[PDB]
Amino acid sequence: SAEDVQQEAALLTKWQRIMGINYEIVVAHVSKFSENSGLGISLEATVGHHFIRSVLPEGPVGHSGKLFSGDELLEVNGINLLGENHQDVVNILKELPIDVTMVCCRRTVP
């Protein structure tokens, strides 16, 4: 618990220092249902940014409960996604193992 908690806190802290105060950072621990299947999300993108378009309630990301449509993808299992090109993001997500730690963000207000 302590090890896990401080590791998750460090991830949050890393990406807070990268994105700044206008973003809420979220860490999700996701388990895929099989090696040969996916995350249960559709994506949309702009140049240098990738977003969750939809979360299927029945899929792995939906089962985590932490991520919502509109969230921006930042990092998965320590691999950077922010500012990468479309092909690299898609290929990185496809190659993920069963257990995935996803870092995302959403714009926020105080």
JSON list of N, CA and C in Angstrom, two decimals, residues 27-109:
[
{"chain": "A", "resi": 27, "resn": "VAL", "atom": "N", "xyz": [-4.71, 8.98, -12.52]},
{"chain": "A", "resi": 27, "resn": "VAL", "atom": "CA", "xyz": [-4.03, 7.71, -12.78]},
{"chain": "A", "resi": 27, "resn": "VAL", "atom": "C", "xyz": [-5.04, 6.57, -12.74]},
{"chain": "A", "resi": 28, "resn": "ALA", "atom": "N", "xyz": [-5.06, 5.73, -13.77]},
{"chain": "A", "resi": 28, "resn": "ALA", "atom": "CA", "xyz": [-5.98, 4.58, -13.78]},
{"chain": "A", "resi": 28, "resn": "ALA", "atom": "C", "xyz": [-5.20, 3.29, -13.89]},
{"chain": "A", "resi": 29, "resn": "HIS", "atom": "N", "xyz": [-5.55, 2.31, -13.05]},
{"chain": "A", "resi": 29, "resn": "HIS", "atom": "CA", "xyz": [-4.95, 0.98, -13.19]},
{"chain": "A", "resi": 29, "resn": "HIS", "atom": "C", "xyz": [-5.95, 0.11, -13.90]},
{"chain": "A", "resi": 30, "resn": "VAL", "atom": "N", "xyz": [-5.56, -0.36, -15.08]},
{"chain": "A", "resi": 30, "resn": "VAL", "atom": "CA", "xyz": [-6.47, -1.06, -15.96]},
{"chain": "A", "resi": 30, "resn": "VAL", "atom": "C", "xyz": [-5.95, -2.47, -16.16]},
{"chain": "A", "resi": 31, "resn": "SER", "atom": "N", "xyz": [-6.84, -3.44, -16.23]},
{"chain": "A", "resi": 31, "resn": "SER", "atom": "CA", "xyz": [-6.46, -4.80, -16.62]},
{"chain": "A", "resi": 31, "resn": "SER", "atom": "C", "xyz": [-7.24, -5.24, -17.83]},
{"chain": "A", "resi": 32, "resn": "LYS", "atom": "N", "xyz": [-6.52, -5.52, -18.91]},
{"chain": "A", "resi": 32, "resn": "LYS", "atom": "CA", "xyz": [-7.17, -5.99, -20.12]},
{"chain": "A", "resi": 32, "resn": "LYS", "atom": "C", "xyz": [-7.71, -7.40, -19.87]},
{"chain": "A", "resi": 33, "resn": "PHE", "atom": "N", "xyz": [-8.73, -7.78, -20.63]},
{"chain": "A", "resi": 33, "resn": "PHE", "atom": "CA", "xyz": [-9.42, -9.05, -20.40]},
{"chain": "A", "resi": 33, "resn": "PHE", "atom": "C", "xyz": [-8.63, -10.23, -21.00]},
{"chain": "A", "resi": 34, "resn": "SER", "atom": "N", "xyz": [-7.75, -9.92, -21.95]},
{"chain": "A", "resi": 34, "resn": "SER", "atom": "CA", "xyz": [-6.89, -10.91, -22.60]},
{"chain": "A", "resi": 34, "resn": "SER", "atom": "C", "xyz": [-5.71, -10.22, -23.29]},
{"chain": "A", "resi": 35, "resn": "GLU", "atom": "N", "xyz": [-4.64, -10.96, -23.56]},
{"chain": "A", "resi": 35, "resn": "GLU", "atom": "CA", "xyz": [-3.46, -10.36, -24.18]},
{"chain": "A", "resi": 35, "resn": "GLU", "atom": "C", "xyz": [-3.79, -9.81, -25.58]},
{"chain": "A", "resi": 36, "resn": "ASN", "atom": "N", "xyz": [-4.73, -10.48, -26.25]},
{"chain": "A", "resi": 36, "resn": "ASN", "atom": "CA", "xyz": [-5.08, -10.17, -27.63]},
{"chain": "A", "resi": 36, "resn": "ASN", "atom": "C", "xyz": [-6.25, -9.20, -27.78]},
{"chain": "A", "resi": 37, "resn": "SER", "atom": "N", "xyz": [-6.66, -8.55, -26.69]},
{"chain": "A", "resi": 37, "resn": "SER", "atom": "CA", "xyz": [-7.76, -7.59, -26.78]},
{"chain": "A", "resi": 37, "resn": "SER", "atom": "C", "xyz": [-7.32, -6.21, -26.32]},
{"chain": "A", "resi": 38, "resn": "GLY", "atom": "N", "xyz": [-8.25, -5.26, -26.34]},
{"chain": "A", "resi": 38, "resn": "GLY", "atom": "CA", "xyz": [-7.85, -3.88, -26.18]},
{"chain": "A", "resi": 38, "resn": "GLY", "atom": "C", "xyz": [-8.34, -3.26, -24.88]},
{"chain": "A", "resi": 39, "resn": "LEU", "atom": "N", "xyz": [-8.33, -1.94, -24.87]},
{"chain": "A", "resi": 39, "resn": "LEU", "atom": "CA", "xyz": [-8.68, -1.18, -23.69]},
{"chain": "A", "resi": 39, "resn": "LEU", "atom": "C", "xyz": [-10.15, -0.81, -23.54]},
{"chain": "A", "resi": 40, "resn": "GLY", "atom": "N", "xyz": [-10.96, -1.01, -24.57]},
{"chain": "A", "resi": 40, "resn": "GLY", "atom": "CA", "xyz": [-12.35, -0.58, -24.46]},
{"chain": "A", "resi": 40, "resn": "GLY", "atom": "C", "xyz": [-12.61, 0.91, -24.58]},
{"chain": "A", "resi": 41, "resn": "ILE", "atom": "N", "xyz": [-11.78, 1.61, -25.37]},
{"chain": "A", "resi": 41, "resn": "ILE", "atom": "CA", "xyz": [-11.98, 3.05, -25.60]},
{"chain": "A", "resi": 41, "resn": "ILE", "atom": "C", "xyz": [-11.88, 3.35, -27.10]},
{"chain": "A", "resi": 42, "resn": "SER", "atom": "N", "xyz": [-12.56, 4.39, -27.54]},
{"chain": "A", "resi": 42, "resn": "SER", "atom": "CA", "xyz": [-12.24, 4.93, -28.87]},
{"chain": "A", "resi": 42, "resn": "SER", "atom": "C", "xyz": [-11.50, 6.22, -28.66]},
{"chain": "A", "resi": 43, "resn": "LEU", "atom": "N", "xyz": [-10.72, 6.59, -29.67]},
{"chain": "A", "resi": 43, "resn": "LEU", "atom": "CA", "xyz": [-9.89, 7.78, -29.56]},
{"chain": "A", "resi": 43, "resn": "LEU", "atom": "C", "xyz": [-10.29, 8.84, -30.56]},
{"chain": "A", "resi": 44, "resn": "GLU", "atom": "N", "xyz": [-9.92, 10.07, -30.24]},
{"chain": "A", "resi": 44, "resn": "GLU", "atom": "CA", "xyz": [-9.93, 11.12, -31.23]},
{"chain": "A", "resi": 44, "resn": "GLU", "atom": "C", "xyz": [-8.71, 11.96, -30.99]},
{"chain": "A", "resi": 45, "resn": "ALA", "atom": "N", "xyz": [-8.34, 12.74, -31.98]},
{"chain": "A", "resi": 45, "resn": "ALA", "atom": "CA", "xyz": [-7.07, 13.43, -31.82]},
{"chain": "A", "resi": 45, "resn": "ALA", "atom": "C", "xyz": [-7.05, 14.77, -32.50]},
{"chain": "A", "resi": 46, "resn": "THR", "atom": "N", "xyz": [-6.15, 15.62, -32.03]},
{"chain": "A", "resi": 46, "resn": "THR", "atom": "CA", "xyz": [-5.75, 16.79, -32.79]},
{"chain": "A", "resi": 46, "resn": "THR", "atom": "C", "xyz": [-4.25, 16.61, -33.02]},
{"chain": "A", "resi": 47, "resn": "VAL", "atom": "N", "xyz": [-3.59, 17.61, -33.56]},
{"chain": "A", "resi": 47, "resn": "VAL", "atom": "CA", "xyz": [-2.15, 17.49, -33.79]},
{"chain": "A", "resi": 47, "resn": "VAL", "atom": "C", "xyz": [-1.41, 17.55, -32.46]},
{"chain": "A", "resi": 48, "resn": "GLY", "atom": "N", "xyz": [-0.80, 16.43, -32.08]},
{"chain": "A", "resi": 48, "resn": "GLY", "atom": "CA", "xyz": [-0.03, 16.35, -30.86]},
{"chain": "A", "resi": 48, "resn": "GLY", "atom": "C", "xyz": [-0.83, 16.10, -29.59]},
{"chain": "A", "resi": 49, "resn": "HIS", "atom": "N", "xyz": [-2.12, 15.77, -29.73]},
{"chain": "A", "resi": 49, "resn": "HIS", "atom": "CA", "xyz": [-2.94, 15.47, -28.54]},
{"chain": "A", "resi": 49, "resn": "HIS", "atom": "C", "xyz": [-3.89, 14.35, -28.82]},
{"chain": "A", "resi": 50, "resn": "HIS", "atom": "N", "xyz": [-4.01, 13.42, -27.88]},
{"chain": "A", "resi": 50, "resn": "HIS", "atom": "CA", "xyz": [-4.91, 12.29, -28.09]},
{"chain": "A", "resi": 50, "resn": "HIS", "atom": "C", "xyz": [-5.88, 12.18, -26.95]},
{"chain": "A", "resi": 51, "resn": "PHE", "atom": "N", "xyz": [-7.16, 11.94, -27.27]},
{"chain": "A", "resi": 51, "resn": "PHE", "atom": "CA", "xyz": [-8.23, 12.01, -26.27]},
{"chain": "A", "resi": 51, "resn": "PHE", "atom": "C", "xyz": [-9.06, 10.76, -26.30]},
{"chain": "A", "resi": 52, "resn": "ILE", "atom": "N", "xyz": [-9.62, 10.43, -25.15]},
{"chain": "A", "resi": 52, "resn": "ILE", "atom": "CA", "xyz": [-10.66, 9.40, -25.13]},
{"chain": "A", "resi": 52, "resn": "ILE", "atom": "C", "xyz": [-11.96, 9.96, -25.72]},
{"chain": "A", "resi": 53, "resn": "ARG", "atom": "N", "xyz": [-12.43, 9.36, -26.81]},
{"chain": "A", "resi": 53, "resn": "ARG", "atom": "CA", "xyz": [-13.71, 9.75, -27.39]},
{"chain": "A", "resi": 53, "resn": "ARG", "atom": "C", "xyz": [-14.86, 9.09, -26.64]},
{"chain": "A", "resi": 54, "resn": "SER", "atom": "N", "xyz": [-14.74, 7.80, -26.42]},
{"chain": "A", "resi": 54, "resn": "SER", "atom": "CA", "xyz": [-15.80, 7.10, -25.69]},
{"chain": "A", "resi": 54, "resn": "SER", "atom": "C", "xyz": [-15.19, 6.00, -24.82]},
{"chain": "A", "resi": 55, "resn": "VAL", "atom": "N", "xyz": [-15.82, 5.76, -23.68]},
{"chain": "A", "resi": 55, "resn": "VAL", "atom": "CA", "xyz": [-15.44, 4.65, -22.79]},
{"chain": "A", "resi": 55, "resn": "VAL", "atom": "C", "xyz": [-16.60, 3.65, -22.79]},
{"chain": "A", "resi": 56, "resn": "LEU", "atom": "N", "xyz": [-16.34, 2.42, -23.18]},
{"chain": "A", "resi": 56, "resn": "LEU", "atom": "CA", "xyz": [-17.39, 1.38, -23.08]},
{"chain": "A", "resi": 56, "resn": "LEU", "atom": "C", "xyz": [-17.51, 0.94, -21.63]},
{"chain": "A", "resi": 57, "resn": "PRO", "atom": "N", "xyz": [-18.74, 1.02, -21.04]},
{"chain": "A", "resi": 57, "resn": "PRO", "atom": "CA", "xyz": [-18.87, 0.60, -19.64]},
{"chain": "A", "resi": 57, "resn": "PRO", "atom": "C", "xyz": [-18.37, -0.83, -19.41]},
{"chain": "A", "resi": 58, "resn": "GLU", "atom": "N", "xyz": [-18.59, -1.69, -20.41]},
{"chain": "A", "resi": 58, "resn": "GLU", "atom": "CA", "xyz": [-18.23, -3.09, -20.31]},
{"chain": "A", "resi": 58, "resn": "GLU", "atom": "C", "xyz": [-16.76, -3.45, -20.54]},
{"chain": "A", "resi": 59, "resn": "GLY", "atom": "N", "xyz": [-15.93, -2.47, -20.91]},
{"chain": "A", "resi": 59, "resn": "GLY", "atom": "CA", "xyz": [-14.55, -2.78, -21.22]},
{"chain": "A", "resi": 59, "resn": "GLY", "atom": "C", "xyz": [-13.56, -2.50, -20.09]},
{"chain": "A", "resi": 60, "resn": "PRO", "atom": "N", "xyz": [-12.27, -2.76, -20.34]},
{"chain": "A", "resi": 60, "resn": "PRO", "atom": "CA", "xyz": [-11.27, -2.62, -19.27]},
{"chain": "A", "resi": 60, "resn": "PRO", "atom": "C", "xyz": [-11.22, -1.22, -18.66]},
{"chain": "A", "resi": 61, "resn": "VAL", "atom": "N", "xyz": [-11.16, -0.19, -19.49]},
{"chain": "A", "resi": 61, "resn": "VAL", "atom": "CA", "xyz": [-11.10, 1.18, -18.93]},
{"chain": "A", "resi": 61, "resn": "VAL", "atom": "C", "xyz": [-12.40, 1.51, -18.18]},
{"chain": "A", "resi": 62, "resn": "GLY", "atom": "N", "xyz": [-13.54, 1.07, -18.72]},
{"chain": "A", "resi": 62, "resn": "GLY", "atom": "CA", "xyz": [-14.81, 1.27, -18.03]},
{"chain": "A", "resi": 62, "resn": "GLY", "atom": "C", "xyz": [-14.81, 0.59, -16.66]},
{"chain": "A", "resi": 63, "resn": "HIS", "atom": "N", "xyz": [-14.18, -0.59, -16.58]},
{"chain": "A", "resi": 63, "resn": "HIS", "atom": "CA", "xyz": [-14.14, -1.31, -15.32]},
{"chain": "A", "resi": 63, "resn": "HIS", "atom": "C", "xyz": [-13.29, -0.58, -14.29]},
{"chain": "A", "resi": 64, "resn": "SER", "atom": "N", "xyz": [-12.26, 0.12, -14.74]},
{"chain": "A", "resi": 64, "resn": "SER", "atom": "CA", "xyz": [-11.47, 0.96, -13.82]},
{"chain": "A", "resi": 64, "resn": "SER", "atom": "C", "xyz": [-12.30, 2.11, -13.25]},
{"chain": "A", "resi": 65, "resn": "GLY", "atom": "N", "xyz": [-13.13, 2.73, -14.08]},
{"chain": "A", "resi": 65, "resn": "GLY", "atom": "CA", "xyz": [-14.02, 3.77, -13.60]},
{"chain": "A", "resi": 65, "resn": "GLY", "atom": "C", "xyz": [-13.42, 5.17, -13.49]},
{"chain": "A", "resi": 66, "resn": "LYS", "atom": "N", "xyz": [-12.10, 5.29, -13.64]},
{"chain": "A", "resi": 66, "resn": "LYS", "atom": "CA", "xyz": [-11.41, 6.54, -13.43]},
{"chain": "A", "resi": 66, "resn": "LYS", "atom": "C", "xyz": [-11.38, 7.49, -14.62]},
{"chain": "A", "resi": 67, "resn": "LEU", "atom": "N", "xyz": [-11.53, 6.93, -15.82]},
{"chain": "A", "resi": 67, "resn": "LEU", "atom": "CA", "xyz": [-11.34, 7.72, -17.03]},
{"chain": "A", "resi": 67, "resn": "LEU", "atom": "C", "xyz": [-12.67, 7.99, -17.72]},
{"chain": "A", "resi": 68, "resn": "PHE", "atom": "N", "xyz": [-12.80, 9.19, -18.26]},
{"chain": "A", "resi": 68, "resn": "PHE", "atom": "CA", "xyz": [-14.04, 9.66, -18.87]},
{"chain": "A", "resi": 68, "resn": "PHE", "atom": "C", "xyz": [-13.82, 10.14, -20.30]},
{"chain": "A", "resi": 69, "resn": "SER", "atom": "N", "xyz": [-14.86, 10.09, -21.12]},
{"chain": "A", "resi": 69, "resn": "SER", "atom": "CA", "xyz": [-14.79, 10.76, -22.42]},
{"chain": "A", "resi": 69, "resn": "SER", "atom": "C", "xyz": [-14.25, 12.17, -22.26]},
{"chain": "A", "resi": 70, "resn": "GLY", "atom": "N", "xyz": [-13.38, 12.57, -23.18]},
{"chain": "A", "resi": 70, "resn": "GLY", "atom": "CA", "xyz": [-12.78, 13.89, -23.13]},
{"chain": "A", "resi": 70, "resn": "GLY", "atom": "C", "xyz": [-11.41, 13.88, -22.48]},
{"chain": "A", "resi": 71, "resn": "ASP", "atom": "N", "xyz": [-11.07, 12.83, -21.73]},
{"chain": "A", "resi": 71, "resn": "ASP", "atom": "CA", "xyz": [-9.75, 12.85, -21.06]},
{"chain": "A", "resi": 71, "resn": "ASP", "atom": "C", "xyz": [-8.62, 12.76, -22.08]},
{"chain": "A", "resi": 72, "resn": "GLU", "atom": "N", "xyz": [-7.52, 13.47, -21.80]},
{"chain": "A", "resi": 72, "resn": "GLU", "atom": "CA", "xyz": [-6.37, 13.45, -22.68]},
{"chain": "A", "resi": 72, "resn": "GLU", "atom": "C", "xyz": [-5.39, 12.39, -22.22]},
{"chain": "A", "resi": 73, "resn": "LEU", "atom": "N", "xyz": [-4.86, 11.59, -23.16]},
{"chain": "A", "resi": 73, "resn": "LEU", "atom": "CA", "xyz": [-3.88, 10.55, -22.83]},
{"chain": "A", "resi": 73, "resn": "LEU", "atom": "C", "xyz": [-2.49, 11.15, -22.65]},
{"chain": "A", "resi": 74, "resn": "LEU", "atom": "N", "xyz": [-1.83, 10.84, -21.53]},
{"chain": "A", "resi": 74, "resn": "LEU", "atom": "CA", "xyz": [-0.47, 11.37, -21.28]},
{"chain": "A", "resi": 74, "resn": "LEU", "atom": "C", "xyz": [0.66, 10.34, -21.29]},
{"chain": "A", "resi": 75, "resn": "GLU", "atom": "N", "xyz": [0.43, 9.19, -20.65]},
{"chain": "A", "resi": 75, "resn": "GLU", "atom": "CA", "xyz": [1.48, 8.21, -20.42]},
{"chain": "A", "resi": 75, "resn": "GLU", "atom": "C", "xyz": [0.84, 6.83, -20.20]},
{"chain": "A", "resi": 76, "resn": "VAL", "atom": "N", "xyz": [1.47, 5.76, -20.69]},
{"chain": "A", "resi": 76, "resn": "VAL", "atom": "CA", "xyz": [0.94, 4.42, -20.34]},
{"chain": "A", "resi": 76, "resn": "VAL", "atom": "C", "xyz": [2.15, 3.56, -19.99]},
{"chain": "A", "resi": 77, "resn": "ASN", "atom": "N", "xyz": [2.11, 2.89, -18.84]},
{"chain": "A", "resi": 77, "resn": "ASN", "atom": "CA", "xyz": [3.25, 2.06, -18.39]},
{"chain": "A", "resi": 77, "resn": "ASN", "atom": "C", "xyz": [4.62, 2.75, -18.58]},
{"chain": "A", "resi": 78, "resn": "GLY", "atom": "N", "xyz": [4.67, 4.01, -18.20]},
{"chain": "A", "resi": 78, "resn": "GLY", "atom": "CA", "xyz": [5.91, 4.78, -18.26]},
{"chain": "A", "resi": 78, "resn": "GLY", "atom": "C", "xyz": [6.30, 5.34, -19.61]},
{"chain": "A", "resi": 79, "resn": "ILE", "atom": "N", "xyz": [5.54, 5.01, -20.65]},
{"chain": "A", "resi": 79, "resn": "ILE", "atom": "CA", "xyz": [5.82, 5.45, -22.01]},
{"chain": "A", "resi": 79, "resn": "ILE", "atom": "C", "xyz": [5.03, 6.73, -22.34]},
{"chain": "A", "resi": 80, "resn": "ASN", "atom": "N", "xyz": [5.73, 7.76, -22.77]},
{"chain": "A", "resi": 80, "resn": "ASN", "atom": "CA", "xyz": [5.08, 9.03, -23.06]},
{"chain": "A", "resi": 80, "resn": "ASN", "atom": "C", "xyz": [4.15, 8.97, -24.25]},
{"chain": "A", "resi": 81, "resn": "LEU", "atom": "N", "xyz": [2.98, 9.60, -24.13]},
{"chain": "A", "resi": 81, "resn": "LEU", "atom": "CA", "xyz": [2.09, 9.74, -25.26]},
{"chain": "A", "resi": 81, "resn": "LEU", "atom": "C", "xyz": [1.88, 11.20, -25.66]},
{"chain": "A", "resi": 82, "resn": "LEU", "atom": "N", "xyz": [2.06, 12.14, -24.72]},
{"chain": "A", "resi": 82, "resn": "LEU", "atom": "CA", "xyz": [1.81, 13.54, -25.04]},
{"chain": "A", "resi": 82, "resn": "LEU", "atom": "C", "xyz": [2.72, 14.07, -26.14]},
{"chain": "A", "resi": 83, "resn": "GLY", "atom": "N", "xyz": [2.11, 14.62, -27.19]},
{"chain": "A", "resi": 83, "resn": "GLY", "atom": "CA", "xyz": [2.89, 15.24, -28.25]},
{"chain": "A", "resi": 83, "resn": "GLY", "atom": "C", "xyz": [3.44, 14.27, -29.27]},
{"chain": "A", "resi": 84, "resn": "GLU", "atom": "N", "xyz": [3.12, 12.98, -29.13]},
{"chain": "A", "resi": 84, "resn": "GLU", "atom": "CA", "xyz": [3.56, 11.97, -30.09]},
{"chain": "A", "resi": 84, "resn": "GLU", "atom": "C", "xyz": [2.65, 11.95, -31.32]},
{"chain": "A", "resi": 85, "resn": "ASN", "atom": "N", "xyz": [3.12, 11.35, -32.41]},
{"chain": "A", "resi": 85, "resn": "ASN", "atom": "CA", "xyz": [2.26, 11.30, -33.59]},
{"chain": "A", "resi": 85, "resn": "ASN", "atom": "C", "xyz": [1.25, 10.16, -33.52]},
{"chain": "A", "resi": 86, "resn": "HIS", "atom": "N", "xyz": [0.25, 10.21, -34.39]},
{"chain": "A", "resi": 86, "resn": "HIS", "atom": "CA", "xyz": [-0.88, 9.27, -34.29]},
{"chain": "A", "resi": 86, "resn": "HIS", "atom": "C", "xyz": [-0.41, 7.83, -34.36]},
{"chain": "A", "resi": 87, "resn": "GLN", "atom": "N", "xyz": [0.50, 7.54, -35.29]},
{"chain": "A", "resi": 87, "resn": "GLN", "atom": "CA", "xyz": [0.92, 6.16, -35.45]},
{"chain": "A", "resi": 87, "resn": "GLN", "atom": "C", "xyz": [1.63, 5.68, -34.20]},
{"chain": "A", "resi": 88, "resn": "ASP", "atom": "N", "xyz": [2.48, 6.51, -33.61]},
{"chain": "A", "resi": 88, "resn": "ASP", "atom": "CA", "xyz": [3.21, 6.06, -32.44]},
{"chain": "A", "resi": 88, "resn": "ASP", "atom": "C", "xyz": [2.26, 5.83, -31.26]},
{"chain": "A", "resi": 89, "resn": "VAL", "atom": "N", "xyz": [1.29, 6.72, -31.06]},
{"chain": "A", "resi": 89, "resn": "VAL", "atom": "CA", "xyz": [0.30, 6.48, -30.00]},
{"chain": "A", "resi": 89, "resn": "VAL", "atom": "C", "xyz": [-0.46, 5.18, -30.21]},
{"chain": "A", "resi": 90, "resn": "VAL", "atom": "N", "xyz": [-0.97, 4.95, -31.41]},
{"chain": "A", "resi": 90, "resn": "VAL", "atom": "CA", "xyz": [-1.73, 3.73, -31.68]},
{"chain": "A", "resi": 90, "resn": "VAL", "atom": "C", "xyz": [-0.87, 2.49, -31.47]},
{"chain": "A", "resi": 91, "resn": "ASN", "atom": "N", "xyz": [0.36, 2.52, -31.96]},
{"chain": "A", "resi": 91, "resn": "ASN", "atom": "CA", "xyz": [1.24, 1.37, -31.81]},
{"chain": "A", "resi": 91, "resn": "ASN", "atom": "C", "xyz": [1.61, 1.12, -30.36]},
{"chain": "A", "resi": 92, "resn": "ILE", "atom": "N", "xyz": [1.87, 2.18, -29.61]},
{"chain": "A", "resi": 92, "resn": "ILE", "atom": "CA", "xyz": [2.18, 2.01, -28.19]},
{"chain": "A", "resi": 92, "resn": "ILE", "atom": "C", "xyz": [0.98, 1.35, -27.46]},
{"chain": "A", "resi": 93, "resn": "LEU", "atom": "N", "xyz": [-0.24, 1.83, -27.68]},
{"chain": "A", "resi": 93, "resn": "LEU", "atom": "CA", "xyz": [-1.41, 1.26, -27.01]},
{"chain": "A", "resi": 93, "resn": "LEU", "atom": "C", "xyz": [-1.60, -0.21, -27.40]},
{"chain": "A", "resi": 94, "resn": "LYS", "atom": "N", "xyz": [-1.38, -0.52, -28.68]},
{"chain": "A", "resi": 94, "resn": "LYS", "atom": "CA", "xyz": [-1.60, -1.91, -29.14]},
{"chain": "A", "resi": 94, "resn": "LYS", "atom": "C", "xyz": [-0.65, -2.90, -28.49]},
{"chain": "A", "resi": 95, "resn": "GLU", "atom": "N", "xyz": [0.54, -2.45, -28.16]},
{"chain": "A", "resi": 95, "resn": "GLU", "atom": "CA", "xyz": [1.60, -3.32, -27.65]},
{"chain": "A", "resi": 95, "resn": "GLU", "atom": "C", "xyz": [1.59, -3.48, -26.14]},
{"chain": "A", "resi": 96, "resn": "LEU", "atom": "N", "xyz": [0.61, -2.87, -25.48]},
{"chain": "A", "resi": 96, "resn": "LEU", "atom": "CA", "xyz": [0.55, -2.94, -24.02]},
{"chain": "A", "resi": 96, "resn": "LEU", "atom": "C", "xyz": [0.30, -4.37, -23.54]},
{"chain": "A", "resi": 97, "resn": "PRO", "atom": "N", "xyz": [0.92, -4.73, -22.41]},
{"chain": "A", "resi": 97, "resn": "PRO", "atom": "CA", "xyz": [0.60, -5.99, -21.73]},
{"chain": "A", "resi": 97, "resn": "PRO", "atom": "C", "xyz": [-0.76, -5.94, -21.03]},
{"chain": "A", "resi": 98, "resn": "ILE", "atom": "N", "xyz": [-1.15, -7.02, -20.36]},
{"chain": "A", "resi": 98, "resn": "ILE", "atom": "CA", "xyz": [-2.43, -7.09, -19.68]},
{"chain": "A", "resi": 98, "resn": "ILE", "atom": "C", "xyz": [-2.67, -5.98, -18.65]},
{"chain": "A", "resi": 99, "resn": "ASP", "atom": "N", "xyz": [-1.65, -5.72, -17.83]},
{"chain": "A", "resi": 99, "resn": "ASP", "atom": "CA", "xyz": [-1.77, -4.74, -16.76]},
{"chain": "A", "resi": 99, "resn": "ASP", "atom": "C", "xyz": [-1.22, -3.40, -17.21]},
{"chain": "A", "resi": 100, "resn": "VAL", "atom": "N", "xyz": [-2.04, -2.35, -17.12]},
{"chain": "A", "resi": 100, "resn": "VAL", "atom": "CA", "xyz": [-1.68, -1.06, -17.67]},
{"chain": "A", "resi": 100, "resn": "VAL", "atom": "C", "xyz": [-1.89, 0.04, -16.64]},
{"chain": "A", "resi": 101, "resn": "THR", "atom": "N", "xyz": [-0.91, 0.89, -16.46]},
{"chain": "A", "resi": 101, "resn": "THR", "atom": "CA", "xyz": [-1.10, 2.09, -15.66]},
{"chain": "A", "resi": 101, "resn": "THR", "atom": "C", "xyz": [-1.21, 3.26, -16.61]},
{"chain": "A", "resi": 102, "resn": "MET", "atom": "N", "xyz": [-2.36, 3.93, -16.63]},
{"chain": "A", "resi": 102, "resn": "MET", "atom": "CA", "xyz": [-2.62, 5.00, -17.60]},
{"chain": "A", "resi": 102, "resn": "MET", "atom": "C", "xyz": [-2.58, 6.28, -16.85]},
{"chain": "A", "resi": 103, "resn": "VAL", "atom": "N", "xyz": [-1.91, 7.30, -17.40]},
{"chain": "A", "resi": 103, "resn": "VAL", "atom": "CA", "xyz": [-2.02, 8.63, -16.83]},
{"chain": "A", "resi": 103, "resn": "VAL", "atom": "C", "xyz": [-2.72, 9.50, -17.85]},
{"chain": "A", "resi": 104, "resn": "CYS", "atom": "N", "xyz": [-3.78, 10.18, -17.42]},
{"chain": "A", "resi": 104, "resn": "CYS", "atom": "CA", "xyz": [-4.53, 11.10, -18.30]},
{"chain": "A", "resi": 104, "resn": "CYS", "atom": "C", "xyz": [-4.76, 12.42, -17.62]},
{"chain": "A", "resi": 105, "resn": "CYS", "atom": "N", "xyz": [-5.32, 13.38, -18.35]},
{"chain": "A", "resi": 105, "resn": "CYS", "atom": "CA", "xyz": [-5.73, 14.63, -17.67]},
{"chain": "A", "resi": 105, "resn": "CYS", "atom": "C", "xyz": [-6.98, 15.22, -18.27]},
{"chain": "A", "resi": 106, "resn": "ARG", "atom": "N", "xyz": [-7.59, 16.13, -17.53]},
{"chain": "A", "resi": 106, "resn": "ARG", "atom": "CA", "xyz": [-8.75, 16.87, -18.06]},
{"chain": "A", "resi": 106, "resn": "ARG", "atom": "C", "xyz": [-8.59, 18.33, -17.64]},
{"chain": "A", "resi": 107, "resn": "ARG", "atom": "N", "xyz": [-9.10, 19.27, -18.43]},
{"chain": "A", "resi": 107, "resn": "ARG", "atom": "CA", "xyz": [-9.01, 20.68, -18.04]},
{"chain": "A", "resi": 107, "resn": "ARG", "atom": "C", "xyz": [-9.89, 20.90, -16.79]},
{"chain": "A", "resi": 108, "resn": "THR", "atom": "N", "xyz": [-9.47, 21.79, -15.88]},
{"chain": "A", "resi": 108, "resn": "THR", "atom": "CA", "xyz": [-10.22, 21.96, -14.65]},
{"chain": "A", "resi": 108, "resn": "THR", "atom": "C", "xyz": [-10.34, 23.44, -14.31]},
{"chain": "A", "resi": 109, "resn": "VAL", "atom": "N", "xyz": [-11.17, 23.69, -13.31]},
{"chain": "A", "resi": 109, "resn": "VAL", "atom": "CA", "xyz": [-11.44, 25.00, -12.69]},
{"chain": "A", "resi": 109, "resn": "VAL", "atom": "C", "xyz": [-11.38, 24.85, -11.17]}
]
